[PDB]
């Protein structure tokens, strides 16, 4: 997250860290949201590769013990059937992970609330992005969970030529674009929490930013629109 602030430990308890085995260590690669006790939602491009993955719930500081973590393996990865590793702009940047065990819910560890199917936000709706991804373009990961206020940019404005053009589809949410605050590599797969009727619901999955750089004026961070996938989500979860 570029231009963020540290989150309080218990602000965003649906946030997870998606980590892969790197020698004999585990490094952060992506975020994700806990959607059931044994199901994580993340981006398809995070799990494109042949790596060994783990999920950390209850994480606040990547580098230090919090006293709250639960560490769990990934049993099955289900990527969306239309996802094409060579075209992120085509969309379907969404993957569901069945974990090796159920996690225990507590104040650090809660499920993420998902929008009702078809839901579209108004322009300039209040949302926060969270993640441990790079805090500058070509910079480094954060140690502690950062948040940024990142208001929405509706489709008519986001698919306008000054913004994203035809690169963004109606199956995506756009948020931010102020040049100062954004998502960045390592935030991918993570939540966009948006305030709706007094409750924060996860409306996005962080997908892509500009090749020019993470915080680019009029290149808002782009999200997979969670409300476009609600039937797919539930169909996966019933059947696995």
> 59 vs 93, which CB is nearer to Ca ion?
59
Host H or E run for residue 79: strand 70-79
Three-state SS string over 118-138 comes to CCCCCCCCCEEEEECCCCCCC
Q: Which DSSP string do the residues of 26-68 spell out, in sequence order?
A: EEEEEEEEEEETTEEEE-GGGSSS---EEEEES-SBTTS--S-
> Residue 63 CB, nearest distance to Ca ion (Å)?
7
Handedness of CA 205, 7, 221, 214 (dihedral sign): negative
**Contact pattern for Ca ion over residues 117 through 136, marking x by CB under 5 A:** --------------------
Question: Catalytic one among 159, 182, 188, 227?
Answer: 188
> 69 vs 154, which CB is nearer to Ca ion?
69
Cα–Cα dist 213/35, whole Å: 30
Closest of 16, 19, 21 to residue 103, by C-alpha: 16
The answer to whether the annotation marks 50 as part of a ligand binding site is no
**Annotated catalytic residue 187:** no
> 140 vs 240, which CB is nearer to Ca ion?
140
User: What values do phi and psi take at 167, rounded to 5?
Assistant: -65, -30
* Residue closest to Ca ion when measured from CB atoms: 66
> 66 vs 167, which CB is nearer to Ca ion?
66
Q: How many CB atoms lie within 10 A of CB 48?
A: 13
> Residue 70 CB, nearest distance to Ca ion (Å)?
11
The DSSP code for 102 is P
Question: Catalytic one among 45, 60, 193, 203?
Answer: 45
**Annotated catalytic residue 188:** yes
Q: How many residues bind Ca ion (CB under 5 A)?
A: 2
Give 24's contacts (C-beta < 8 A, 6+ positions apart): none
> 12 vs 155, which CB is nearer to Ca ion?
12
> Residue 166 CB, nearest distance to Ca ion (Å)?
41
> Residue 206 CB, nearest distance to Ca ion (Å)?
21
Closest of 91, 94, 92 to residue 41, by C-alpha: 94
Q: Which of residues 29-88 bind Ca ion (CB under 5 A)?
A: 61, 66
> Residue 146 CB, nearest distance to Ca ion (Å)?
15
Question: Catalytic one among 93, 203, 210, 227?
Answer: 93
**Annotated catalytic residue 60:** no
Cα–Cα dist 221/177, whole Å: 7
Binding residues for Ca(2+): 59, 61, 64, 69
Residues labelled catalytic: 45, 93, 188
Q: Which residues bind Ca ion (CB under 5 A)?
A: 61, 66
């Amino acid at each position: 997250v570029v231009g963020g602030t540290e989150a309080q430990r218990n602000s965003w308890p649906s946030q997870i860290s998606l980590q892969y085995r790197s020698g004999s260590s585990w490094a952060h690669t992506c975020g994700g949201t806990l959607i059931r006790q044994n199901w994580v939602m993340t981006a398809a491009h995070c799990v494109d590769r042949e790596l060994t993955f783990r999920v950390v719930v209850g994480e606040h500081n990547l580098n230090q013990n919090n006293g709250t973590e639960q560490y769990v393996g990934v049993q099955k990865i289900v990527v969306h059937p239309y996802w094409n590793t060579d075209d992120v702009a085509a969309g379907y940047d969404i993957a569901l992970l069945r974990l090796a065990q159920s996690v225990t819910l507590n104040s650090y560890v809660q499920l993420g609330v998902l929008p009702r199917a078809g839901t579209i936000l108004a322009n300039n709706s209040p949302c926060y992005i969270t993640g441990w991804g790079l805090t500058r373009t070509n910079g480094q990961l954060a140690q502690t969970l950062q948040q940024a206020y990142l208001p929405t940019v509706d489709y008519a404005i986001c698919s306008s030529s000054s913004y994203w053009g035809s690169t963004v589809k109606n199956s995506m949410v756009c948020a931010g674009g102020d040049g100062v605050r954004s998502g960045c590599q390592g935030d991918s797969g993570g939540p966009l929490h948006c305030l709706v009727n007094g409750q924060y619901a996860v409306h996005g999955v962080t997908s892509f930013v500009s090749r020019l750089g993470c915080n680019v004026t009029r290149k808002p961070t782009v999200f997979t629109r969670v409300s476009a996938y609600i039937s797919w989500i539930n169909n996966v979860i019933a059947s696995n």
